[PDB]
Amino acid sequence: LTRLILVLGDQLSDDLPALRAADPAADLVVMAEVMEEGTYVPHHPQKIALILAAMRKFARRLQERGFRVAYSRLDDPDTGPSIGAELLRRAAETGAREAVATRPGDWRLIEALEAMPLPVRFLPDDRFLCPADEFARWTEGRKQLRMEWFYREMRRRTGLLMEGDEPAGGKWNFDTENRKPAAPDLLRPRPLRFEPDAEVRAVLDLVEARFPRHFGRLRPFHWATDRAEALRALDHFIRESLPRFGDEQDAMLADDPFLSHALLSSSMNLGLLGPMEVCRRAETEWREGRAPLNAVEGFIRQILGWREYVRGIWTLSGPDYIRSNGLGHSAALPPLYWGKPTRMACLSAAVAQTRDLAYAHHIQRLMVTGNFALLAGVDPAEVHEWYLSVYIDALEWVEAPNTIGMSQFADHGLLGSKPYVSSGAYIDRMSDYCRGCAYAVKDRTGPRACPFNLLYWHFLNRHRARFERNPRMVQMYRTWDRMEETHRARVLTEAEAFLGRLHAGEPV
Ligand SMILES: Cc1cc2nc3c(=O)[nH]c(=O)nc-3n(C[C@H](O)[C@H](O)[C@H](O)COP(=O)(O)OP(=O)(O)OC[C@H]3O[C@@H](n4cnc5c(N)ncnc54)[C@H](O)[C@@H]3O)c2cc1C
Ligand SMILES: Cc1nc2c(=O)[nH]c(=O)nc-2n(C[C@H](O)[C@H](O)[C@H](O)CO)c1C
Numbered sequence: 260l261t262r263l264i265l266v267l268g269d270q271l272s273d274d275l276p277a278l279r280a281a282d283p284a285a286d287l288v289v290m291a292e293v294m295e296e297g298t299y300v301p302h303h304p305q306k307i308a309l310i311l312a313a314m315r316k317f318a319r320r321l322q323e324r325g326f327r328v329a330y331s332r333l334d335d336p337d338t339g340p341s342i343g344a345e346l347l348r349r350a351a352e353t354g355a356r357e358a359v360a361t362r363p364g365d366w367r368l369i370e371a372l373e374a375m376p377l378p379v380r381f382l383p384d385d386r387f388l389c390p391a392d393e394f395a396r397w398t399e400g401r402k403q404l405r406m407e408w409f410y411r412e413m414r415r416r417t418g419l420l421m422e423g424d425e426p427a428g429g430k431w432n433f434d435t436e437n438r439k440p441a442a443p444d445l446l447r448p449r450p451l452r453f454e455p456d457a458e459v460r461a462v463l464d465l466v467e468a469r470f471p472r473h474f475g476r477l478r479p480f481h482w483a484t485d486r487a488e489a490l491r492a493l494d495h496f497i498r499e500s501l502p503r504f505g506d507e508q509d510a511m512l513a514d515d516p517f518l519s520h521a522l523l524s525s526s527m528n529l530g531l532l533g534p535m536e537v538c539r540r541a542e543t544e545w546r547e548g549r550a551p552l553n554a555v556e557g558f559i560r561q562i563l564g565w566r567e568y569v570r571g572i573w574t575l576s577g578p579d580y581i582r583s584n585g586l587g588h589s590a591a592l593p594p595l596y597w598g599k600p601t602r603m604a605c606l607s608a609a610v611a612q613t614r615d616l617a618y619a620h621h622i623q624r625l626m627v628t629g630n631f632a633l634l635a636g637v638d639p640a641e642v643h644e645w646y647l648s649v650y651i652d653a654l655e656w657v658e659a660p661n662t663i664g665m666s667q668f669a670d671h672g673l674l675g676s677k678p679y680v681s682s683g684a685y686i687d688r689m690s691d692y693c694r695g696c697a698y699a700v701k702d703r704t705g706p707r708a709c710p711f712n713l714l715y716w717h718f719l720n721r722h723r724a725r726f727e728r729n730p731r732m733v734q735m736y737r738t739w740d741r742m743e744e745t746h747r748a749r750v751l752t753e754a755e756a757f758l759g760r761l762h763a764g765e766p767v
């Protein structure tokens with residue numbers, strides 16, 4: 260009569276569907292720290308540490324609430340290699356004939372649990388604002404998807420920034436106001452960091468010993484490891500940084516890795532925060548004249564729009580999504596991505612902070628590291644491995660669409676009809692990187708030519724047949740055509756030379 264109740268490491272929510280369905284008197288909660296989940300990609304040590312530590316804390320909390328918990332520690336030699344091995348073990352110990360599980364957000368894990376010779380009753384993950392079945396319904400018959408239309412509908416369903424049947428402040432979307440560079444500022448707060456207690460430190464010591472060859476600096480470790488801490492991170496952001504969120508959303512500063520971003524993605528993704536509570540707090544700040552509407556709406560749109568939309572695309576696209584390669588790109592990831600030196604200031608900055616903090620803000624992920632990998636023709640499978648490995652907040656469901664779709668343009672165009680690529684001019688306008696860089700951003704050719712200046716046109720040229728039949732990009736080819744033929748030839752000869760060095764592993 261005992262049933263197993265699985266709680267995975269991204270399911271640390273009090274009101275998790277599986278827990279709702281359990282009988283604390285009869286059922287056994289099962290949690291397991293296992294090598295398979297620690298190595299399916301070589302996760303940033305900070306990520307591994309975050310999950311294991313939050314797992315232990317949550318297990319103890321489940322005990323405080325009355326559940327019986329069977330917890331398999333990574334450092335127990337009795338622990339098996341996978342979530343499945345531990346479910347089976349506990350079935351044997353217990354007599355249970357069935358496990359209940361909130362459906363995870365990783366296709367490989369889904370399949371593993373189905374393949375397990377123990378039946379699993381899956382429940383939907385209801386921690387999103389848009390239910391799966393409702394996302395599917397909204398998309399049906401649409402020959403083209405666009406996040407914006409989905410977002411407006413989510414605004415209406417939820418009531419967020421809605422004054423009647425009208426959007427707050429008389430228009431829907433304020434992204435046009437959120438695209439300026441930012442200045443250094445004494446009055447700009449730094450986000451809240453958290454010191455590990457002894458139990459987190461025990462996990463840090465474990466991860467250092469057990470996963471030494473993964474890319475990333477483990478210490479200092481500063482992320483929230485339970486709900487109490489995450490709520491403080493929330494409060495900090497709402498009070499101190501939300502009013503700048505809009506003006507500074509696309510900015511980059513060589514000396515500030517965080518600017519005014521919330522640094523909440525990991526907390527939301529593991530279940531420590533929920534999106535409604537986050538969006539509502541932000542809305543209140545507008546209603547009380549503390550945060551401007553471009554800021555609050557910009558913030559909400561990232562969670563209510565993109566986060567939700569991305570989850571939907573993941574769900575619909577299935578287990579073969581990560582095999583998408585619409586542009587036929589096949590190059591290795593350059594060594595600079597795993598920390599080898601590069602003279603490109605922007606990339607260096609981004610990879611360095613990814614190494615050290617397990618965190619890059621959105622515009623870095625999209626327009627620096629993402630943009631460069633696309634321009635250089637890296638296989639999207641390789642880009643996908645990297646983003647899913649290196650960031651504190653990375654799990655398949657949220658990383659895959661952002662990486663394969665939004666950034667690498669490898670899919671059907673569901674996350675943007677125009678690829679996010681640029682020349683160096685864009686990085687120059689939005690950051691202060693270029694003055695410190697050995698490359699010359701204003702040079703279109705020559706030994707000092709910014710590599711984005713070469714690869715941008717090379718990219719457009721090599722994919723002209725497909726992109727020129729694309730309204731939103733016809734202009735760019737017009738500008739290319741109006742240039743002397745010898746200038747074009749030189750640009751391509753030089754991009755080609757660069758690419759040869761890049762993909763040979765030469766420092767660039
Ligand atoms: C190539 C690529 C890979 C990405 N991988 C991840 C990932 O693994 N995990 C992840 O949570 N986000 C991912 N993103 C989206 C976004 O970059 C991060 O969510 C954001 O950087 C998290 O930092 P923050 O908390 O400071 O976010 P903020 O800038 O403060 O934004 C606020 C919140 O909005 C949400 N958000 C904003 N953009 C997105 C997005 N496009 N998709 C989903 N949520 C969004 C997050 O919950 C975030 O906490 C990726 C984006 C790109 C381009
Ligand atoms: C590194 C890691 N380790 C574990 C683990 O040891 N045990 C566990 O239950 N979950 C872990 N996770 C999170 C899962 O991989 C997660 O459920 C999927 O990545 C997405 O739902 C991760 C990411």
Ligand code: SF4
Pocket residue numbers: 602603604605606682683684686687692693696697698699700709710711
């Ligand atoms: S010149 Fe080019 S490579 Fe150097 S920081 Fe600017 S955009 Fe990056």
Ligand SMILES: [Gd]
Pocket residue numbers: 582584638640
């Ligand atoms: Gd492939």
Ligand SMILES: [Mg+2]
Pocket residue numbers: 434437508509
């Ligand atoms: Mg933007």
